Structures are given as structure tokens and as C-alpha cells.
């Protein structure tokens, strides 16, 4: 639907959509921009991520509300209310899965394969892990283990690159570690791995802060605080 709009206009409108808190539009504009076939700049990658994270974040929050209602509905003592709660949870779930499949499709066609610098490759592999993780959150069938493994594999490749090519304070490296740690805690039933990863990441970043400018220090310490928040919650 965006094929007839200039790439630059799509990027401009994505920024306008962000200002207007129109995240579905923002995501559609950024999808159109990706489909032009050119690589994304750092700013453009961040627009893509903001757009889809906001869209899928609203879907995930709604899914959790509906899943909780459905769970209460299937407690013994609860009255039969019919198929409607399940149906509507399934509707939201299918829409969520569709968004995740769309993002994964953009990464596979062809953002990852064209991404050679560590900053872009780690960013996209982190995103791949994230959207498989969101699929894993709602998965219950025969492919659930494979979905979890797909998330793990993408995160692991991103981690391996990030450790070799980025400093321990790099915000992309830190955000990847944060999310992989959440994967371990919430998805893979590995709370000790989650805690170890968060603590090692935090400590290695702390030791590298002395190399940073004031502005970089602010960026890195912000994400370190997210790691600390999780460590405080989990221990």
C-alpha cells in the first residue's frame, strides 16, 4: 500500500505518526520504508523498533487481560459464559501473531542478510529474538519448543557478536542482554541464568563507564538501571 510513496516521505510520516502517538500508522510507514529495499540508518532502525514495539505492546497487554479473564472463567465455581472470552482472546492473539510474523518477515526479507556492521546486525537479531519471544508468550502447541528455540538462537547470535564487537556499555548490547535475561526468566524457565546474565552485564558495564562522555554515560546508565530493577525484583 506504501509502494507509491517516496522512501523519504514514509520516514517523515513515521516521525509525524510518532509525534501523534499513531503507532499503527508509524509501523505501516516504516514497513513501507523497509520494503523499498535499502538498508536502514541508525535513526530509521529505531523508528522501526519504536513503531512495532508500541503496536505489539498494546496487543500483548490486551492479550494478558483477556487471558486472565479466560483463566478465571475456567476455575471451578465459575459460571459458564460461553465461547466468547476464548474467541476474543483468540482474535487478539491472532492479530498479535500477525504483527510478529510481519516483523520477522521484514527481518528475513532482507534486513538481516544485508546487515554487516555490528550495530545493525545485533539490533536486528535482537529484534528477531524479541518477536519470537512474543510468539512464545502465547504459544501452547506442538511448535512452542521450536518457537522458544528460535528466540534463543537469535538472541545467542546477537550476544556472540555484541561481546566480540561492542564495548560492554554499548546501549544496543545492554538492551539485548536485558531482553535475553527476560527471555531466560520468563520463557525458558531459567531464572538463575537470567540473574547471572543481568548481573554480569551490569558489572561489566559499570567497569567501562569511565571511558564515556557525559551523554554516553547517561545513555548507558539508564539501561543499567533497568537491569538493576530486574535484579531487585528477582532476588
Amino acid at each position: 500500500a506504501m509502494g507509491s510513496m517516496e522512501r523519504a516521505s514514509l520516514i517523515q510520516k513515521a516521525k509525524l505518526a510518532e509525534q501523534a502517538e499513531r503507532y499503527e500508522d508509524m509501523a505501516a510507514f516504516m514497513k513501507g520504508a523497509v520494503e523499498k529495499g535499502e538498508e536502514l540508518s541508525n535513526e530509521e532502525r529505531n523508528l522501526l523498533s519504536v513503531a512495532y514495539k508500541n503496536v505489539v505492546g498494546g496487543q500483548r497487554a490486551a492479550w494478558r487481560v483477556l487471558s486472565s479473564i479466560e483463566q478465571k472463567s475456567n476455575e471451578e465455581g465459575s459460571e459458564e459464559k460461553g465461547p466468547e472470552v476464548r474467541e476474543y482472546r483468540e482474535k487478539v492473539e491472532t492479530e498479535l501473531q500477525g504483527v510478529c510474523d510481519t516483523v520477522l518477515g521484514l527481518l528475513d526479507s532482507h534486513l538481516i542478510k544485508e546487515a554487516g556492521d555490528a550495530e545493525s546486525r545485533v539490533f536486528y537479531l535482537k529484534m528477531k529474538g524479541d518477536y519470537y519471544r512474543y510468539l512464545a508468550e502465547v504459544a501452547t502447541g506442538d511448535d512452542k519448543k521450536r518457537i522458544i528455540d528460535s528466540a534463543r538462537s537469535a538472541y545467542q547470535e546477537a550476544m556472540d557478536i555484541s561481546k566480540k564487537e561492542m564495548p560492554p556499555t554499548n546501549p544496543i548490547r545492554l538492551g539485548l542482554a536485558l531482553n535475553f535475561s527476560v527471555f531466560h526468566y520468563e520463557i525458558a524457565n531459567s531464572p538463575e541464568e537470567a540473574i547471572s546474565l543481568a548481573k554480569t552485564t551490569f558489572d561489566e558495564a559499570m567497569a567501562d563507564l569511565h571511558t564515556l562522555s557525559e551523554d554516553s554515560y547517561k545513555d548507558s546508565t539508564l539501561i543499567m538501571q533497568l537491569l538493576r530493577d530486574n535484579l531487585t525484583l528477582w532476588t
Binding site: 505492546g57 524479541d130 539485548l176 531482553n179 533497568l226 530493577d229 530486574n230
Partner: peptide, 7 residues
């Protein structure tokens, strides 16, 4: 108090 991921 929900755990943090990278927003």
C-alpha cells in the same frame, strides 16, 4: 511491579 524489557 512488572519486570523491565527494552522499550
Amino acid at each position: 511491579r512488572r519486570r523491565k524489557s527494552c522499550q
